[model samples]
Target: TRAHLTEVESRLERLEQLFLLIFPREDLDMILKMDSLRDIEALLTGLFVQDNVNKDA
Candidate 1:
């Protein structure tokens, strides 16, 4: 039935928030060939403000 493709809304939103922000180049484990030098977590917790604000509104 291809049910896995359906995706969970909350998890999808979390990924979406990350994906859109650091898709081109990211790091944690490691990165090379393509790097822009970005800080991931410190600013991450503050990234999803709008998503939840407008989710049910």
Candidate 2:
């Protein structure tokens, strides 16, 4: 519902906030890398669970 606008806005503001802080914050430089890890974390969890489920098949 709602064209996922809420999701879009959520990510937009977060990334934009990181942008403004790029110079002063210098935190997002490292934050950006961790973001990727979060994505991988999702995949890792999926693979781990799927393997256990498949074991019963």
Candidate 3:
């Protein structure tokens, strides 16, 4: 069950990142209040960095 929860949280974090890219800042803040902002931010940062690496490569 713990693994399942982690998987669910991971997916939620991805969706939240996608939301961040598309939503206006004020409206995005409202949705961000519902979940783990720090975790999502870290995840998004990692993803952004990885994307940059791929682009550079």
Candidate 4:
């Protein structure tokens, strides 16, 4: 479990790095990463669900 969590943490950090590179935290905006697996999963699920539902309409 620790190893898996570590892997997930690394991935999250990498994602944050990508965000920084692509859209640095300037004076106007910022990036916010979900710190929990459940939250992240729910966020992803919600994003996909919304995308698909919009497409279906």
Q: How high is each candidate's TM-score?
A: 0.22, 0.30, 0.28, 0.28
Candidate 2 colliding pairs: none
Q: 29, model 3: CA deviation in Å?
A: 18
lDDT values, one for every candidate:
0.55, 0.65, 0.66, 0.61
The sequence of per-residue lDDT tens digits that candidate 4 reaches over residues 1-57 is 346757788899878778744565564333344224566568777875344444555
State residue 42's C-alpha deviation in candidate 2, in Å. 54
State the displacement of the C-alpha of residue 32, model 4, in Å, after optimal TM-score superposition: 21
- What value of lDDT does candidate 2 attain over all alpha carbons? 0.65
Global lDDT of model 3: 0.66
> In candidate 2, what are the lDDT values of residues 1-57, reduced to their tens digit?
558768898899878877773456545567666556665567777765344444555
Candidate 3 per-residue lDDT over residues 1-57, each given as its tens digit: 346757788899878887854575556565567665677577877865344344554
**Model 4, stretches more than 4 Å misplaced?**
1-3, 20-57
Q: Which stretches in model 2 have alpha-carbon errors above 4 Å?
A: 20-57
Residue 22 shift from truth in candidate 2, angstroms: 4.5
- Writing each residue's lDDT as its tens digit, candidate 1 over 1-57 gives 656545776678878877853555745544432353444442565574333444565
